[PDB]
Design a protein around this nucleic acid. Structure first.
Ligand SMILES: OC[C@H]1O[C@H](O[C@H]2[C@H](O)[C@@H](O)[C@@H](O)O[C@@H]2CO)[C@H](O)[C@@H](O)[C@@H]1O
Ligand SMILES: OC[C@H]1O[C@H](O[C@H]2[C@H](O)[C@@H](O)[C@@H](O)O[C@@H]2CO)[C@H](O)[C@@H](O)[C@@H]1O
Lengths: 436, 411
DNA sequence: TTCACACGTGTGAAA
DNA sequence: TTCACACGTGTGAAA
């Protein structure tokens, strides 16, 4: 619960929350307002649950794709930056946080996956996914692997699924069509099949998660990983000399990562909107604010023009934005969470052998497009069955009371119904078969 | 490939492996789930208290100390090999607090003194009842009373005057804003390691991260409550072999010949301290560390955790009681009353679930066949589409009943 | 779109 | 122990 006079921030555990706390300390030193930064697990899921009742942090950080669902649920304050401040950030980052014509968060940085490779183990990274199996065969002879990345979050395999034609929601006529899902087309199946076949041919393992891949690459056991700018800090501290380059092609086509804009939304229930707004506009989104976060864990391409023009000189940022250009900014519509849940199930089930590729993507197709009933539709259904049971209960109450049907002391309603049927000239077998 | 909890020295055990490991979430919960399908680990490490429920469900010599073996044995058999003895201790910042408090009762006044300097007195994980149980047991609270050579499931003490007094004091610390109900492991560790809070409660595994920080810390006895010692539940980190593992003795020799060495326990121990290890050879060296001396001084005023299968229901019950009372969702009396009831709660067997599933399937099939027959041969004056309640009404009127709109029925 | 029966488990009865 | 109606949501029909 937000208490007035201080700020509590939620940011994911892979970002530079220690650097962000340093910005919080400067804010506390100038205005007196205490700023606490926390990184709980599954925070993008926890926020919509607690924020609906007015709980949750003052400020929540996540990629922009989750915020439109938050805004639709009335969990976010509208962001009211003056025009002079809006111009300090790239226009496309503001677009990422615009929903129903209103700005619902401050954009922070642009995130895109890249290929990260070990220069010493592999001076020339592969340009295509197709040459990965042969490469791993060649590295397995020296006790190494070619490629390990997180297969528990669909974010990391989506560039491959999208390469030959898979997509989330088709953009048409200025809008995303929530009924036009492309996780089931030929391109998506081609990309996921190539992933599943790397697993079947023992080039990757289906249970590899984030920490396994990160540990493997930074210990020098795999030649390549796929990860974002936040991951560069831990590689720097390791004994691995790495490079950041474009993702491999698949069927001669570029991998298309879904591009995220790390964003900071303000809780609609916060009694500290202006202090939150002041912290974000005049402390975080400054050169010095972003620098403190970025030196903890790299942010990627920051939305603030002044600081990005220094970060853009870094060849790792150049590669990041090269992959970003080949990808697409994620939608922010509320249906994105249902899309992500569906594809997560599909990748894990197909990587696991629990479902075929076609069956997994077929189910993900319908789940991502499924119409979610509103609270009122749910309540209508709940009341209809409550009423149906209520009418039945009164009928059987009356039948038991006045029937004198020659029944055992404690019998179910089916027995009462049977006694009623026989009274009306019917025969009811034990299994329920009924006729006159 | 082996499962160890993410707060232990998994890198230190990985270094043992290379000369010869993953840290999942909720591993203690996942293993009973994935064993029933033959999935899971070769070897699972956890405190001994969970292994009896495992042994009851069938999922699993003198170098090591005698009592460490007793903790990992259930039904006359030995289900894991003990590695280390764990007890919580009070960890304190010497620079902020040269003289740590010896009672819980003086922590409120201390926190008011520290709040004026921008600090707090105490932060520790309030989401896991392991960390609050020492205070709950101080004035008399207990899990299952040991009597007559066994733990009695009919004598549970999470609801007595001592337990209430401990939880009431904890809740009062929160209501007087000396602690926050939502403080978890990560928040408490960060605050202490950054020098923001004067004290924390944690085990030996946490010492490594404090060493990495700039905080001069000491480890000492937990504070008393009502003049009585804090009584932590003492855990023996143990090593069970999966009953379904095809590599049992290849894993067993890894246990005895590579892990439980001094070279290898050392190697894990320098990653994150294990506590008082079960191996005597190496324990004589670590025993001279004053932090280990403090750990076992807390351990002797505590009790060894039971390993009986009810421990899971006990911990779950206690965990929701603490969270519900901390947050204000339940009063202390109501929260512990619910915990007392649920601490021994029976879980229905698979077959019992299946009995219920089949019974209701049969109930619906009998009704469905009655209404199918009525619709087919009734030739009732029903609408084109209507529910079975409408058929039932039409059957009632045929038998000489009248049924009102809402279902009130009479002759 | 609304709607009905299915579905497995919850609450608590009867013993 | 077994048992039965309650319970809200799933599946899929009818429109
Ligand atoms: O995997 C689905 C997941 O993808 C994205 O999450 C990214 C996030 O954008 C990055 O900042 C980083 O934390 O990696 C995450 C994947 O683990 C979406 O932003 C998220 O909504 C979605 O669930
Ligand atoms: O909080 C309930 C929990 O307590 C113990 O868990 C300890 C564990 O023994 C330690 O090794 C360390 O991991 O901290 C844990 C608490 O977060 C019991 O072992 C466990 O069964 C119980 O659920």
């Amino acid at each position: 619960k937000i208490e007035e006079g201080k700020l509590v921030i939620w940011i994911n555990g892979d970002k530079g929350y220690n650097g962000l706390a340093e910005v919080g300390k400067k804010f506390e030193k100038d205005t007196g307002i205490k700023v606490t930064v926390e990184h709980p697990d599954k925070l993008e899921e926890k926020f919509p649950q607690v924020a609906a009742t007015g709980d949750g942090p003052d400020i929540i950080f996540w990629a922009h794709d989750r915020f439109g669902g938050y805004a639709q649920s009335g969990l976010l304050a509208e962001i009211t930056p003056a025009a002079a401040f809006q111009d300090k950030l790239y226009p496309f980052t503001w677009d990422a946080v615009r929903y129903n014509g209103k700005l619902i968060a401050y954009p922070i940085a642009v995130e895109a996956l890249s290929l990260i490779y070990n220069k010493d183990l592999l001076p020339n990274p592969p340009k295509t996914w197709e040459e990965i199996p042969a490469l791993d065969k060649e590295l397995k002879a020296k006790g190494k692997s070619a490629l390990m990345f997180n297969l528990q979050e669909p974010y990391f395999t989506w560039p491959l699924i999208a390469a030959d034609g898979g997509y989330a929601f088709k953009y048409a006529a200025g809008k995303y069509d929530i009924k036009d899902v492309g996780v089931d087309n030929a391109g998506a199946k081609a990309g996921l099949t190539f992933l599943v076949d790397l697993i079947k041919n023992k080039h990757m393992n289906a249970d590899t998660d984030y920490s396994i891949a990160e540990a493997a690459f930074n210990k020098g056991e795999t030649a390549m990983t796929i990860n974002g700018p936040w991951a560069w800090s831990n590689i720097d501290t390791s004994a691995v000399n790495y490079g950041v380059t474009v993702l491999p092609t698949f069927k001669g086509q570029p991998s298309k990562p879904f591009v995220g804009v790390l964003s900071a939304g303000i809780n609609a229930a916060s009694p500290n909107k202006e202090l939150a707004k002041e912290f974000l506009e005049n402390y975080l989104l400054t050169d010095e604010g972003l620098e403190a976060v970025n030196k903890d864990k790299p942010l990627g391409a920051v939305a603030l023009k002044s600081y990005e023009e220094e970060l853009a000189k870094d060849p790792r940022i150049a590669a990041t934005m090269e992959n970003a250009q080949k990808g697409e900014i994620m939608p922010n519509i509320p249906q994105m969470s249902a899309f992500w849940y569906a594809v997560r199930t599909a990748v894990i089930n197909a990587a696991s052998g629990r479902q075929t590729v076609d069956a997994a993507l077929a189910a993900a197709q319908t789940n991502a497009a499924r119409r979610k009933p509103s609270w009122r539709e749910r309540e209508n259904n709940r009341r209809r069955e409550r009423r149906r049971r209520a009418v039945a209960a009164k009928i059987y109450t009356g039948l038991r009371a006045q029937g004198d049907y020659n029944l055992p002391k404690h019998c179910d309603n089916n027995e009462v119904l049977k006694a009623l049927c026989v009274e009306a000239g019917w025969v009811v077998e034990e299994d329920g078969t009924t006729y006159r």
